[PDB]
Amino acid sequence: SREKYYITTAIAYPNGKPHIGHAYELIATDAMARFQRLNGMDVYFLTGTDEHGIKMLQSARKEGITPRDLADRNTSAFRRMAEVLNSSNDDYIRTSEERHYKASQAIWQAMVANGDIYKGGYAGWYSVRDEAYYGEEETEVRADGVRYGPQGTPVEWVEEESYFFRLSAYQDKLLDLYENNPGFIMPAERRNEIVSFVKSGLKDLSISRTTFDWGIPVPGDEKHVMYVWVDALTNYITALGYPDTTDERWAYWPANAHIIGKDISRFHAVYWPAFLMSAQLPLPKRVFAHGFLFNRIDPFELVERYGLDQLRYFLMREVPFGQDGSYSHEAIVNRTNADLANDLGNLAQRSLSMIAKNCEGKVPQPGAFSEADKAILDQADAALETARKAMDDQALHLALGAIFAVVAEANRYFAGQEPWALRKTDPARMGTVLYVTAEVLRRVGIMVQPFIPQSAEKLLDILAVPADKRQFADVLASPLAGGTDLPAPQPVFPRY
Ligand SMILES: COc1cc(Cl)cc(CNCCCNC(=O)Nc2ccccc2)c1
């Protein structure tokens, strides 16, 4: 019985087209999910779309179609993005689906049963100019006879009927969660902003609207529809068949990792665990927030220009996962050409071309390993353990850095050994250097699979590695057998 691993992306708002922020999140989470599959886990990987709300109703009114029709049309682009990005998601969740309507209504009833939902209103001062709420003390009536907020704009007393979740009851329980799980909300900078926020006191949370019907109705009060909080976050349990706990997929709960953007960190580390606690459900083991990408841009055009695995590699390598980063035409071209086309690509071509020409297209029979041979072989084995430990802390750049440090060293190894000169001098020793090179390329090939799957598959194909020997366990246990026929080598990473 393989151990279970549930991982998710935050669900995208399909109000516009797919931006690069959505692509980045999906790529990172896809790589993590693939990594765990290869590491032996029973993986479930989810992504999807948040389709309700006032902005979506208004967009639909503008184009002269129903909100559902619009939701269908715009979400197809996000489905197509997942396909073009080579996403290995086992399901695609859409908030408009019946299964989500039932699951959101179920968790709402569970929270009503726990005594955490009441009907009331959100009565206070609102600045229409600042688009924010204020307490009375932050305001001041001026000579106008008009009340102003703290930013010098008028405020107006807005009053709207709303259901509330009793978030004020979960302060001490959430603080206990953070003390008992240091890794619940990462990276470290996110945690501190969450702990500081919860310490300063939590007020009860508005969870329904009366201003639009494009939403999930509130049970026993259909004039209200559910606001974003209960709707969007419940997608993670909808995908496992909630509220049916007899479903085969329900064993995947709790989620091992919710991968999200930094902007929605509060909603996944404060509101979401409070809801789960109220509904008598276990909490996710980690929420990891990534940073944003700036242009120092449409993900379909980037993939077409630079290549998919080139983009996947760059985003995961150059930006430390958690921090903000940049991408430019110059940076993508340089770093992919250097690491993929030159370092990994040419090392495969030079070595495997020598096997095709000098060793009759067969893996050479290796003799004794020198101290140089051992070092590069052991460094490749050690990269897997550094990669495993890094991926537990969502440090994708550190995983790729360790794997491509082996590639860089293997190039220096191959060059120092001078196999070309050994062809005349000592053919048997040439065979050993070429064996060692191919063997390191196999180990690297297996290890890079989650990050660059199609290109990794090609490399392993030209090493004649069978389909059932491409797990991480095969790095130590399934080395290349001398005498095996290899197909004619072709370049895996063409230069830009
Ligand atoms: C609820 O916290 C979030 C959870 C996830 Cl998984 C993702 C996000 C980020 N999505 C963008 C938010 C904009 N969408 C929105 O407000 N939808 C909405 C509005 C009213 C009623 C139901 C959904 C926010």
Residue numbers in the entry: 2 to 297, 309 to 508
Sentences from the paper on this structure:
Comparative sequence alignment data showed that BmMetRS clearly has one knuckle and is in the same MetRS1 family as TbMetRS.
We also identified 2 other compounds, 1415 and 1433, exhibiting ΔTms of 3.1°C and 2.5°C respectively. Compound 1312 IC50 value for BmMetRS determined using the aminoacylation assay was 6 nM compared to 272 nM for 1433 and 1657 nM for 1415. In each structure there were three copies in the asymmetric unit that were roughly equivalent to each other with average internal RMSDs of 0.81, 0.35, 0.64 for 1312, 1415, and 1433 respectively. Although the changes are similar in the presence of all three molecules, they are different relative to the conformational pose observed in the presence of substrate analog selenomethionine. This allows for Asp51 to make hydrogen bonds to the “urea-core” of each compound, coordinating the tail end into the newly opened pocket (quinolone pocket Fig 5). To accommodate each substituted phenyl groups of the inhibitors, Trp230 rotates out and away to create the necessary space.
